[model samples]
Target: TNLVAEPFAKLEQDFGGSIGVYAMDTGSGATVSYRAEERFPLCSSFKGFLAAAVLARSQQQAGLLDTPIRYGKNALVPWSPISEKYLTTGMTVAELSAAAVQYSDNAAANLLLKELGGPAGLTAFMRSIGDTTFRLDRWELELNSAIPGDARNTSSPRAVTESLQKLTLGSALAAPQRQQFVDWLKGNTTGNHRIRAAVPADWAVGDKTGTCGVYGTANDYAVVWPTGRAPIVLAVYTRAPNKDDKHSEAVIAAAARLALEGLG
Candidate 1:
């Protein structure tokens, strides 16, 4: 029975959209799931996994993180504030990854995508890590369309949370790379109003946010460390039926609150 998900259903109803969520208590292995198998747009949230992919590759490619990548104006794209600031001087691979994850810099993401052999290659990396429900079929702007019924570039919340757990707290990434990925996520500047809003100010939390700009599509995922309990990893995603629908940060935060209350 999905009775445990009643609160989530009411939360979605009030927002006039659908919400998918999955949370794991690493210490106990207990989970809270709601519409967790449903597909949702990856949006800029994929950048977090993209950064993790780069970290994994760095394990085999010596000096890969420090390698400088030079690009001209052509590589620039919308919402690429960080990458645009470093236009004249080339940024290192690690810098691009940080910018992509922390700032959701579109150009930085595309540049790193090229380095990894494009969207297909990123998908291959996820598959290597045992994730079966993740797919990235398009580049930035197009991928954000998030049209109903089109699953071009989407993933389930459960898959996102599980993969995040593996990379952040498991053996999916080497120690150095794993910590680096966590650092990037912790430094994220765009997720303050989402999952972060539901957490206590004293606890440590690192998250990534995604907004599709339409379809009321937006999401957030995080790993939170409490005082006495083991860490928790969770993902929350939302979408509406209408193209003109608008996303709500409050809804995401409210859902996170309910998820934590359930686990607490």
Candidate 2:
């Protein structure tokens, strides 16, 4: 428990917002937690959970990974790079899954949610993973506003931390399949300003990012594979006063850097 506390102190002094972070060694159970029990709005980070549920289904049924996901105007979500890239095309479950995680693509996520049996499937999957506090209740942003504000997707840092731990230990999927999940997260391009921005060059990191402009939520959950050391699962969640997230990104990056240094 040699976690450095100064970085978190500085982050709080500078950011002036609600912040939560949790980090745990994959090999050992040692943890560093700061308000990790509090739930925060889980914007696109919920897609990571959705991806887990999809992977779970594919694990249960062989060849489900190759299921076709057709794209049309109905799936066109305004903020999604995937929707823009393939405005009208068909992709396999594997392809869309990659898009959903790597690009935080709303359209692809919504499609996978439908395929995963919507909220119920996500909930059951969470329960199977021993996580009940996290909920996936909406298809995408357009539907997000329609849902009761309290019912919108939310999860504590501890829940996300445990989820990543389960994923890393192959509790959610077998070794090869979980490796696919890791690869998708490794390809994530949206969190460059968060954990990835601060980790050592030799470290391998896979993470998911969530951003809710309307709700002022920015979050990143990552598994860090440090060279010559055990892997670490870390989650940082921030709720800013407004849409601006530069402060949140800084807080997350600082927290990850401190955790990495402390673990080393």
Predictions: Cα RMSD each: 0.9, 2.9
Candidate 1 local distance difference test against the native:
0.93
Residue pairs whose backbone atoms clash in candidate 1: none
**Which residue pairs clash within candidate 2?**
none
Question: Which has the greatest lDDT?
Answer: 1
Per-residue lDDT of 1-264 in model 1, one digit per residue for the tens? 577899999999999889999999999988888999999998999999999999999999999999999999999999999888877899999999999999999999999999899999999999999999999988776789999888878999999999999999999999999999999888899999999999989878889999996999999999999878899999999999999999999999999998888884
> Candidate 2, TM-score vs. the true structure?
0.89
Per-candidate Cα lDDT values, in order, are 0.93, 0.78
List candidate 1 stretches off by more than 4 Å: none
- Give candidate 2's whole-model lDDT: 0.78
* Candidate 2 deviant stretches above 4 angstroms: 1-7, 142-151, 241-247
CA lDDT, candidate 1, residue 133: 95
